[PDB]
């Protein structure tokens, strides 16, 4: 093969293949009799016209047609003898083609560069052994009661989780600031449209008393025009209300996924539901800490090929929830996916190198556990277990993710992972 294996820059290697003039004239000629076979005129051809005339005159048009295929034949030929896995996208830049002469084309694609594992032991991860304890079960169920609470009033008693109606006239550092007043605002104690100090001056009093409270805006408080200043607020209590606990009626409580509607069945139901959410979110917690530590610790020039792949999956994922844009996903703004995808590539490169270094292989029983528990999140596990385990293509996909998780925990066994046992209030319940 007549080739010029150059390199544009780093990964972008330019195998400028020039198909030999003789080889083109023969390959086109061999394709032209195939055209005649497609139209069945090959057997009607009595050989009265020699093959040179039908190739040079008639087949003068049908040249680039054949070259489109020929470029790919020399491509797969080249990368096999070069031992390159074709990264990038094979870019056939056609120099030119004369009548039956040599066809120069610069095939620009990427190669895989040197990967360096480092700072593996330096990575500080946390392993929060979180469960939904009886405190979390009843506490969060109680929050659900107080979110779906029946509105009521009471005569002069406010607490931390009640409701109030006030009109205030505040001043920050002595200035009647932006607004100053806020007339007849209904403060459901348990909201987050005000800072501590303010809410603490509301949630321990009764209606009739019109007083002031002293609050101060934090140093962390991102509003600099308020930050550090002490705000005096003349709170006028006019209404004392309560967001009263509603009835956990059998016909209501059953609707949370309980058959008979037993309270103990709801506590059990939210145990398994909140834990199904929880342990998957613990997985995301520990994994993303390890993953960020990996990228930040490690250096490699990242192939645009794999970036395009991860972007593409994120484009499908976006379009899926962005009205369900039917394969319009490809056109979605790349810049939204660019950085996070490139990150997800560095993940795949380093974790793949951790699979190599720690010589790992996916465990079938581990893949099984992943399937049955991921599917236990639905009322349709059986068809999922069948969809994966009766399909080697998708089972191999789930071996990929299993082995990727083995690669994470392989880095965790090296990394500074602080393991602790704690309640549901830890993980997602960071409402601050």
């Amino acid at each position: 093969m007549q080739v010029s294996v150059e390199t544009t820059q780093g990964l972008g290697r330019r195998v400028t293949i020039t198909i030999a003039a003789d080889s083109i004239e023969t390959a086109v000629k061999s394709e032209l009799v195939n055209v005649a076979k497609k139209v069945r005129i090959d057997g009607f051809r009595k050989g009265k016209v020699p093959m040179n005339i039908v190739a040079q005159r008639y087949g003068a048009s049908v040249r680039q047609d054949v070259l489109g295929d020929l470029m790919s034949r020399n491509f797969i030929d080249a990368i096999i003898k070069e031992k390159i896995n074709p990264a990038g996208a094979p870019t056939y830049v056609p120099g030119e083609y004369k009548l039956g002469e040599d066809f120069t084309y610069s095939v620009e694609f990427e190669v895989y560069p040197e990967v360096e594992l480092q700072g593996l032991e330096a990575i500080e991860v946390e392993k929060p052994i979180v469960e939904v304890t009886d405190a979390d079960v009843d506490g969060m169920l109680d929050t659900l009661r107080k979110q779906q609470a029946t509105w009521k009033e009471k005569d002069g008693a406010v607490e931390a989780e009640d409701r109030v109606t006030i009109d205030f006239t505040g001043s920050v550092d002595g200035e009647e600031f932006e607004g100053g007043k806020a007339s007849d605002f209904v403060l459901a104690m348990g909201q987050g449209r005000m800072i501590p100090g303010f809410e603490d001056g509301i949630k321990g009093h009764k209606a009739g008393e019109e007083f002031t409270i002293d609050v101060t805006f934090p140093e962390e408080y991102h509003a600099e025009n308020l930050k550090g200043k002490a705000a005096k607020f003349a709170i006028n209590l006019k209404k004392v209300e309560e967001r009263e606990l509603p009835e956990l009626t059998a016909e209501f409580i059953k609707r949370f996924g309980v058959e008979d509607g037993s309270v103990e069945g709801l506590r059990a139901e939210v145990r398994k539901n909140m834990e199904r959410e929880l342990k998957s979110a613990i997985r995301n917690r520990v994994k993303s800490q390890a993953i960020e530590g990996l990228v930040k610790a490690n250096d490699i020039d990242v192939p645009a090929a794999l970036i395009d792949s991860e972007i593409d999956v994120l484009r499908r994922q976006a379009a899926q929830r962005f009205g369900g844009n039917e394969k319009q996903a490809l056109e979605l703004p790349r810049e939204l996916f660019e950085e996070q995808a490139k990150r997800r590539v560095v993940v795949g490169l380093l974790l793949g190198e951790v699979i190599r270094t720690n010589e790992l292989k996916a465990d079938e029983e581990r893949v099984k556990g992943l399937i049955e528990e991921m599917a236990s999140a639905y009322e349709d596990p059986k068809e999922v277990i069948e969809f994966y385990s009766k399909n080697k293509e998708l089972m191999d996909n789930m071996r990929n993710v299993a082995l990727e998780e083995q690669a994470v925990e392989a880095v965790l066994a090296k990394a500074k992972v602080t393991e602790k046992e704690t309640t549901f209030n830890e993980l997602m319940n960071q409402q601050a």
Partner: protein
């Protein structure tokens, strides 16, 4: 001698205009978002805690089991799409003990 303009009401009115509950809305960018991304200026108008989108996908018609069927598009039971037939054909020696296909180029 026009001090009565500078002090007119409070300053101008109080300062300028009002609000539902008058404070200057500062962010508190911690949340369940652990120290991993940059995002030094998130903005984000309040939001809802952390986890919200779950029982609805906000697309097609997928929420209640009535209209969840057929258009069952909510990322129910996930899978990787690396491009091509995983191995493709040419892997030669990626030097791994099982073909990891998170991502793959060429097409």
């Amino acid at each position: 001698v026009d001090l009565d303009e500078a002090v007119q009401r409070a300053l101008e009115f109080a300062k300028k205009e009002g609000n539902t509950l008058v404070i200057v809305t500062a962010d508190h960018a911690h949340a369940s978002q652990i120290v991993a991304p940059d995002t030094k200026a998130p903005g984000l108008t309040q939001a809802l805690n952390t986890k919200d989108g779950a029982v609805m996908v906000m697309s097609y018609g997928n929420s209640e089991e009535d209209s969840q069927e057929h258009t069952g598009s909510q990322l129910r039971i996930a899978a990787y799409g690396p491009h091509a037939a995983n191995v493709v054909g040419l892997t030669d020696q990626t030097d791994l003990f099982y073909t990891m296909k998170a991502a793959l180029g060429l097409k």
